[PDB]
Amino acid sequence: QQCVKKDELCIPYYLDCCEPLECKKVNWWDHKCIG
């Protein structure tokens, strides 16, 4: 699947972010793209 831009949501164990971001939890409830 496509990547994910930083600041954009996402789902752990489903989609992944572009790079070097990481499609995971950005906080404790909101899941987006990090690094």
Residue 13, Cα to own-chain centre: how many angstroms? 10
Residue 33 identity (one-letter amino acid): C
Q: Are 28 and 12 in contact (CB under 8 A)?
A: no
E strand residue ranges, 1-35: 23-25, 31-33
**Structure-token pair, residue 9:** 């949501």
**Structure-token pair, residue 31:** 């899941």
Instruction: Write down the experimental method used for this entry.
Output: NMR
